[PDB]
């Protein structure tokens, strides 16, 4: 049942200047260590509940699960898309299937950019794998809802936002904030998760 | 644990003129039991995906559970809320907090009524009781939504306002199955629930 | 300006044994009839609204509006996508996509069906096109929500599955009833719709 | 169908230390600007698209109509509900009435806090006015859903839990911000909304 705030795999201020440190500080060891605790509160709540075939219980818990759950299986994937040693464009295979289902690397960036400011409130723009149809495609999702359990898409790519994870830098202009995180985008994690459903 | 379809406690035709007898026989023998066994599937399958930690698989299964949980629990609730001898009014308590909170017995089942036939789609109407605040309360709730899972709110009583509740014997006009229905209220077991949760 | 009931290209009867004429009556005559009637109400309602520059009331006309306008949308095309004649496969570019996106003709009917039963409560299964992808896409819609006003996808088959368009005839086995819809299908109404958004 | 942003009845600087300048100023000048803008927009489309009978278009515009209208809606409400001279706790009918529908002033104060560190995602915590039962009522709405259009409730007083309109001074511990914000809260305007539907 337990679950653990995973170290992040490189220093709070690696991401400098295009994500702040104290962003990122506030981010992973408040923010999501915060969706860790109440995941574990709730898994274990939901264990009793399901030992006891207490329905109305296991149905009350649910909003809290997705919710947390969805915000560790979230943020634990956005940590490895970035590294201080990424940018660019991709290549290989991942970068041909872009250009195969978008048309280009930049109608691609566009895509996501246009997906991830539409968000009304809180949310994620995906990246995501159809495995049934064997081509890439955009997704937004809502507050924490995680991409593969609401959608069946594998997730490739995150970007959360959440007003938290840009506004002590670029106040309320979303735009600039997609902007820049171009920048450190780990493609070569990207590429990890592409190439793993593709026996 | 395991969860039973339970036993009517009257015949499949004991509520006739106003519910036939193939609805009954349909909506208990056929949608209840498909519920309970689609519970009882989803809910090993959940057991396993907690004891992995898989929070994905979790999230997923939850439209299933909500909807065969939530079935379930409605059915339940709903035999025991009709009875060959119901119809007429409560008595003590109960119809005195009506009357406190609704104004009068029969401005209850115009706003219950209201609510009922109000549903878009599948849904429930739902006399409910708001332990925080200790009044009445009605509340709609969409498909298998259960009321008490979803709202917090203790059942009371419910109306099945699934089309498979009437269409065999009323075709599309809701409001003269709503007519019906009131003629075969179990009161009695409406108190009942109303006085377990008053301390 | 104001919306029409309109008249069924056959008789009621033209499609038995599949949808037997008790069915197609009152689901012409009745159910749509009601949405086209309650439209048109509704639309007017707005108008007042929108000139006062009522936000309130307009936010809270959205439901009304949706369901019925959309109940309006949906039947109308559903009506368009049966025929007497019906039945068989589509022919040229309709067949050929549909290999192109689902593999076999025979694919694609398993996952409408899959995607149709999979309904908890009432809605819709559609056939859709996706204009900026360029090819076939399968969804579902809940209650009324209309496919291309809530999902942007081209709507070209709809396959009811509210209670109210099967349940007189195949009570709960709602597979029963995706069966024999497949015999009515009007496929030459269907590759219109899909040679109109195709440049 | 032209709405403008409202003047603020105070200076940006006059709720320091309890909301900063540069919030008030970044959340009037911005935020609110933002969402009347694309309030006028959207209604402007929606004329067009009632005036020809466009369903489709009507029901495709209905997030944006509810997102930035709602945003509208609740925003001037926000303002009017703060003061510089505001704190303490209400008096006349209005604290009477909260002490009868909640038991205290400082119940009251938990059961709104409560309600509103409880919003998953972005959203408003709204103490609001039930006329069909005559009392007050605790709600919470989810993104910019408005009190009224949403739930039928009137609203009283709003508020603000999206990360945008605290996050810059009190990061991410929204109950340090919920603390601070009962030292501005405009009573005699709280007021006047109850009074004005108590004829
Ligand atoms: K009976
Ligand atoms: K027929
Ligand atoms: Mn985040
Ligand atoms: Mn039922
Ligand atoms: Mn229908
Ligand atoms: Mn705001």
């Known amino acids: 049942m337990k679950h653990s705030l995973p170290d992040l795999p490189y220093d709070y201020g690696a991401l400098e200047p295009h994500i702040n440190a104290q962003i990122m500080q506030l981010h992973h060891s408040k923010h999501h260590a915060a969706y860790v605790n109440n995941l574990n509160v709730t ?19 649910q909003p809290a699960l997705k919710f947390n759950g969805g915000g560790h299986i979230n943020h634990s994937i956005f940590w490895t898309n970035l ?76 970007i959360d936002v959440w007003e938290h994870a840009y506004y002590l830098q670029y106040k309320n202009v979303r735009p600039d ?15 990890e998760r592409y190439m793993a459903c593709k026996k």
Chains 1, 2, 3, 4 share one sequence.
Do not use: M
């Open 43 to 61: 898994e274990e709540k939901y264990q009793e509940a399901l030992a006891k075939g207490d329905v109305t219980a296991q149905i009350a818990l």
């Open 83 to 158: 590294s201080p040693n990424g940018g660019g464009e991709p290549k290989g295979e991942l970068l041909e299937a872009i250009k195969r289902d978008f048309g280009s690397f930049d109608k691609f960036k566009e895509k996501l950019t246009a997906a991830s400011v539409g968000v009304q409130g809180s949310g994620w723009g995906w990246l995501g794998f159809n495995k049934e149809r064997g081509h890439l495609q955009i997704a937004a999702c809502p507050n924490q809802d995680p991409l593969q359990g609401t959608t069946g898409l594998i997730p490739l790519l995150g």
């Open 177 to 191: 904030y997609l902007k820049a995180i171009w920048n450190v985008i780990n493609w070569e994690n990207v590429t």
